[PDB]
């Protein structure tokens, strides 16, 4: 408050201190929001006790996994899907750095977020769903896919004689998903929307300094060179009331947006717990069709789920009896 409302003027600070404890509340609200955001990232991503590493030999019964497994050739150990997601979200700027609107860095940087997603992918590709309940128990990937087939109703022998066709369909879908992300202009609408909303809120708060709020001038230091302090303090109070109201409006809008983001992060954590760590029988929860298994993918200010589902096709009608 003492640096946004008052441009490093001691008389304005003495007038602002007279208003009382109005500004410790805003700082405590912003610190609570930051702690809540760090907690949100921690509960969505940090769910596995141990980091699992995939074996160097990447054969899983014919299933291609190069699009979602991390690439050691890149400077950041990220999948091509994660790289394309990071290149499709974009985060003067010095004005918010000059009137006190600082931006704190997150506790979990993108490298360890990618490491968490890599550990989750290795666990769900090697141990099946057993690593989400206790110790990781290894299992061949065709057998795990057969049991995920058995979980939806169809017996395992269908996979055991259609393994090549199913692997080719999975590879085709996971290859088409990148071009689907690239061609769609509004695919990452929410992740662009959150950063755009934050940028617009910060820009509005910076731009609100130019208003006069009933005073003769908007610049604070021009007031002292033209008026006696009995009326300069009146104009200062007139500016302080409007600036404090603008700050309060920004804080309560940020609180509402933080509550919405917290609800979205709780939903994302539930989806990570259910669709990824196991198999979910909830209809239309992990994608359209009968859910088999899911893939977590890191993203700027969010997470992306790759839901692999079972869609029946080529139906024929017969005659039945009870």
């Amino acid at each position: 408050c003492t640096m946004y409302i008052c441009g490093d003027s001691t008389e304005c600070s003495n007038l602002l201190l007279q208003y009382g404890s109005f500004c410790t509340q805003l700082k405590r609200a912003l610190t609570g929001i930051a702690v809540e955001q760090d907690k949100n990232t921690q509960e969505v991503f940090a769910q596995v006790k141990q980091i699992y590493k995939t074996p160097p030999i990447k054969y899983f019964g014919g299933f291609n996994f190069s699009q979602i497994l991390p690439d050691p050739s890149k400077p950041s150990k990220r999948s091509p899907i994660e790289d394309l997601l990071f290149n499709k979200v974009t985060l003067l700027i010095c004005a918010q750095k000059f009137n006190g609107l600082t931006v704190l860095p997150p506790l979990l940087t993108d490298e360890m977020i990618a490491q968490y997603t890599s550990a989750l992918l290795a666990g769900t590709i090697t141990s099946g769903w057993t690593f989400g309940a206790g110790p990781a128990l290894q299992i061949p990937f065709p057998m795990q896919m057969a049991y995920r087939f058995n979980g939806i109703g169809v017996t395992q022998n269908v996979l055991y004689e259609n393994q090549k066709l199913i692997a080719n369909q999975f590879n085709s879908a996971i290859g088409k998903i990148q071009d689907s992300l690239s061609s769609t202009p509004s695919a990452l609408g929410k992740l662009q929307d959150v950063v755009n909303h934050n940028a617009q809120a910060l820009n509005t708060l910076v731009k609100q300094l130019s208003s006069k709020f009933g005073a003769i001038s908007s610049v604070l230091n021009d007031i002292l060179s033209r008026l006696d302090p009995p009326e300069a303090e009146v104009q200062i109070d007139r500016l302080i009331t409007g600036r404090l109201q603008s700050l309060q409006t920004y804080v309560t809008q940020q609180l509402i947006r933080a509550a919405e983001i917290r609800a979205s992060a709780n939903l994302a954590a539930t989806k990570m717990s259910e669709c990824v760590l196991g198999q979910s029988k909830r209809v239309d929860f992990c994608g359209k069709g009968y859910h088999l298994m899911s893939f977590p993918q890191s993203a700027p200010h969010g997470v992306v789920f790759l839901h692999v589902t079972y869609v029946p096709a080529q139906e024929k009608n017969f005659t039945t009896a009870p």
Partner: peptide
């Protein structure tokens, strides 16, 4: 981030 672990994966072995 936690303990580094590497469960051995092979296409003929299971753990029960």
């Amino acid at each position: 981030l936690g303990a580094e672990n590497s469960v051995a994966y092979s296409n003929n072995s299971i753990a029960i």
